[PDB]
Amino acid sequence: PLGVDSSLSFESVGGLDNYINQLKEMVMLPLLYPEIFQRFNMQPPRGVLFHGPPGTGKTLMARALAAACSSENKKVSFYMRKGADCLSKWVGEAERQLRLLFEEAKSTQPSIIFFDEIDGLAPVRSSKQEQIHASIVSTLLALMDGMESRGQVIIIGATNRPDAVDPALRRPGRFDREFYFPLPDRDARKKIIEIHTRNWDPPVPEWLCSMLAEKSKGYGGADLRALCTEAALNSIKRTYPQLYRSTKRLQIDPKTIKVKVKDFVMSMKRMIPSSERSSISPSKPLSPELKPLLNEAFQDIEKTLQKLMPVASKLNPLEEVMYDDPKENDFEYQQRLETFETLRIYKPRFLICGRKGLGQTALGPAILQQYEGVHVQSFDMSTLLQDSTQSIETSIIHLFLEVRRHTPSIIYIPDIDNWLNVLPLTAITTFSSMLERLDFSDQILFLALSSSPLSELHPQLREWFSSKQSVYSLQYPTRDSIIAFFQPILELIKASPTELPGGIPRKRRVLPELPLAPEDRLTPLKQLLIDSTTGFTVDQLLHLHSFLYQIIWNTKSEWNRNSVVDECERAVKEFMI
Amino acid sequence: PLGVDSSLSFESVGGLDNYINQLKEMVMLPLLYPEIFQRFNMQPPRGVLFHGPPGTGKTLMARALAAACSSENKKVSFYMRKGADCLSKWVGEAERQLRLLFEEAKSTQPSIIFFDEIDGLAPVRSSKQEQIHASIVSTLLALMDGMESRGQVIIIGATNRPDAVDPALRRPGRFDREFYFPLPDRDARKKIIEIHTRNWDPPVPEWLCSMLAEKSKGYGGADLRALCTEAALNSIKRTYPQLYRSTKRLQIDPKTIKVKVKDFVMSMKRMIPSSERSSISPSKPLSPELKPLLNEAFQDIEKTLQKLMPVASKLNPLEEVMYDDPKENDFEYQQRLETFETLRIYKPRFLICGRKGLGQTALGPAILQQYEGVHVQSFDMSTLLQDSTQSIETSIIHLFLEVRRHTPSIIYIPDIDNWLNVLPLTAITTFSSMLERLDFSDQILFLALSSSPLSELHPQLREWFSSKQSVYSLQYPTRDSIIAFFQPILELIKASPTELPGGIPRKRRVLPELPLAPEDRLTPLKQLLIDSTTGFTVDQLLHLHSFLYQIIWNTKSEWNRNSVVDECERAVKEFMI
């Protein structure tokens, strides 16, 4: 059956190395080196506040910390407190459980305590309720620190939000660490999936990683293990159909090890993402047959993206200090590199103008997918009108405040032709103010999408975007790209009966026992598809593509060729209306 | 490891001298001199209410008061009460803890009690809740004073806000002291940082103070100590890389004392301000290479600032009464100096008109930084639309009321060209009324910024600001200031390979053991940069400055000179479109 483990070698949360060194410098040093705390007479406190996606290192870095320190040294004890679990309606009974737990935590000397659900442990301190909201918060203040020199004990905090509570709970000088979980995307995703998949006596192929790791976006350690279990059970029922209706119990052979990539892709048909349980995010790669239709400008988007903003990230200070320099006295040499790759910028924004039905609003999610690791959100007016409890301008100042409270991050607005007709001049001039409230010298991108083409626009954008390179206009694709797009189906006309299942028999499987345990017109069709379709829009090409898919689906079984051209050609004739 | 101290000689809150003498006159005299309280038969009560930034003398003046009186005389006892810590849902049980604490506080004769979180101790007294909100407030009234001659005991209050509660809690005659904490800016900042840094056996240099003290703005005693610890640990990992992965424990040498200014500036890269945890304040000094482009008028701003308002502050009455005068009977001589430096004023305001892209909205934060110690806020419509629970005009009358409840203080509005299109005539005529609701004879500054130049304006400002010196117009800078600005990079063309890291090798550091414990075209380029750039705007100069930074970044490694002029010159040619 099932079972939980108490040993973790960072094998389901693995990849947060700089976090690991940051916590190692907090928890290892005070009793590893007990001398330099008097050589300098130094304090440094301990305590980390987790925030980010839950289960992406919430329970997983809980096991990574208890397993980390248990694998670190002997002896050491560990404590798990998950929200309100020692409380009452009394103050003086709730708390007497709490500080009996505190005094026994102080009695056991090598000891850490996990505290999760810090909102449930201590909410915001308001006096418009009963005074236990002030009482347990103040008594946790004095009983964690302030009055209480805790000595050798370590207090761990975890939330989903870094600001779900009043900042008195983060007194600066006791809880000076806060860890954000960035949900690793591609490479530590491939690391975390391959450190999972080696727990099987069949080693997995490594062409499927980072193939499956780039398919899997928005997942924790546990649900990627759920992908492991669902592909596993797909191998189970796949290998054996006789898994049903057993009152007389059965026995098995132990040689039931067969693995498919079909198991994984059926798991992808049968999955659901964790972030996409309640969200809608445009995390959509560009369509692979549409790459003949948009790679040619997509390259210009990613190159001019790279030029108008470097996407350069921070290296590890471990290897940086593994390097050494000779000169260390020169703050002028410091302000040199502090000017380097920092003062090279000015106000990241970009605009897309082009016709409707011409590759719109898919390239947006595509260039969202062409690089990751950055923080990003968009001013979707669905996400702006989603609350009415406050003003929408209060929501504007809020969301501008949180994208201010990040890394160099990404801001997007779709459909600005329809937008600015949606909200009044309150929110308009609000936003135009908030455009200028921040500096040029920070790196926040401002992607902008319009479904209307150029030189016809209200000038609100124009005074905002008077740079000649702050915009790009779109054109029709070339005929060679067109015939590149219709190429594969133009040989799928010829490969019906046994290449495709239009004429492939599907046969039955027998049950196991599992014993008892007690050609020539192709070119006039070519001049029908080309040169009579005078460079139209790509959605119309999607119409035709769907239509011919219906044609070849209905005409899926045919031998003795050149008999199935009449259906598609008259469909083109009808399409020209 | 860590540890708290019980002795403070005003070494982390040091600088509030007049506050210290004010509290000394409250707490020392009643038992120092027990005779003059019958010579005059005088009351004077005791009790101070702290308000201001927390941890900037909240916990720090708590330790300064208990350490102050403990270092004052023997014997004396101290009590610490932090919000709701003796309460219940009963009235009669909550209170019986409270006045058992009161009677034991009266039993111990030399005794003071710290009371913090006065909102959590006693909220506003409303009868639209349960009556314990009236009960504990009324019983704290009668049990602190009113009915109870407290005798010899001292009651200390502390909040963040001076008006977080109904003013019945400040009965005039028991709590007649209230201390505001002004967050000392430059000189007591240098005093407070140097009284920290002498706690190390390496004495720090004193060119870095007040250099680092003028870099550090918006910090308490504790987080400046956190700057001490982070520069300390930066020296730790900086001196020693072998601080990792030790199950077999290690031992050290005690000679690990090396200090860098690099440690501090990396701490500045890795810091976060306390006031800037949720705020956005334009506390921004002018850019040092932009000083050739705005010092010439900046001097006029600070001089005419000084003339249109003296910034003269109050001296200490200690040294003032250390001086003596012969004549003390003359209230007419009193109203002389009461007319001196008080009646010399009229209605402080100032206006900035000038073109867009021409030094705007950076000089504002700069002259905010050119002097400090004054109280200041601005009517940012982000900060005006940030709440919708009340009317925005209610917010107007509120904020006018609190800037009325201050020192001679500072009021600013940015972007008045875009403003007055943001709010209706309700808030407009509201504000114009509140312009005239106060007198000429008080000293409140009214800085005003417009991005549009002169002689083109709607006259609402003109009837408000019909003084010929109430406004200043802006011009283009001179060519000598231009070539002064482009001067340093115009020698950074010549100093690539070893002055800059474009051709400097970065080498590796070995691990310690730490043993086991069980030229000629420069002038045509000069006539390309000057005299073909016909006195343009400074943001365009920022474009070019960024562009050439990219040029020299890409061309960073070059010997055998005069080969790298072609890239920048064609960048200028492309820029001229």
Residue numbers in the entry:
A (entry chain F), B (entry chain A): 256 to 773, 1128 to 1186
Give excerpts from the publication.
ATAD2 (also termed ANCCA) is a histone chaperone that has been implicated in nucleosome density regulation by histone H3–H4 loading or removal. Although histone chaperones responsible for nucleosome assembly and disassembly usually do not contain ATPase domains, ATAD2 is unique because it is the only known AAA+ ATPase histone chaperone. Here, we demonstrate ATP-dependent histone H3–H4 deposition onto DNA by Abo1, the fission yeast ortholog of ATAD2, using an in vitro single-molecule imaging technique, the DNA curtain. We solve the cryo-EM structures of Abo1 in three different nucleotide states (apo, ADP, and ATP), revealing a major reorganization of the AAA+ domains from an open spiral to a closed ring—a structural change that can also be recapitulated in real time by high-speed atomic force microscopy (HS-AFM).
To dissect nucleotide-dependent structural changes of Abo1, we next determined the cryo-EM structure of Abo1 in the ADP state to 4.4 Å resolution. We then performed flexible fitting of the ATP-model into the ADP- and apo- cryo-EM maps with MDFF16. Comparison of the ATP-Abo1 Walker B mutant structure with the ADP- and apo-states revealed striking differences in the subunit arrangement, heights and individual subunit conformation, while the structures of the ADP- and apo-states were similar to each other. In the ADP state, the subunits assumed similar heights forming a symmetric planar ring, whereas in the ATP-state, the subunits were staggered in height and shifted towards the center forming an asymmetric spiral with a smaller pore. The most prominent structural change could be observed at the interface of subunits A and F where in the ADP state, these two subunits maintained similar heights with close inter-subunit packing, while in the ATP state, the subunits were staggered in height and separated by ~40 Å. Individual subunits in the ADP state did not show any significant differences in their structures, supporting the idea that ADP-Abo1 is largely symmetric. When comparing the two extreme conformations of subunits (subunit A and subunit F) in the ATP-bound structure with the conformation of the subunit in the ADP-bound structure, we found that the bottom-most subunit in the ATP-bound structure (subunit A) superimposed well with the subunit in the ADP-bound structure, while the top-most subunit (subunit F) diverged significantly from the ADP-conformation. Lastly, but more interestingly, in contrast to the ATP-Abo1 structure, the bromodomain density was stronger and more symmetric in the ADP- and apo- structures. When ATP hydrolysis occurs, Abo1 transitions to a planar ring with a larger pore, potentially allowing for remodeling and/or release of histone H3–H4.
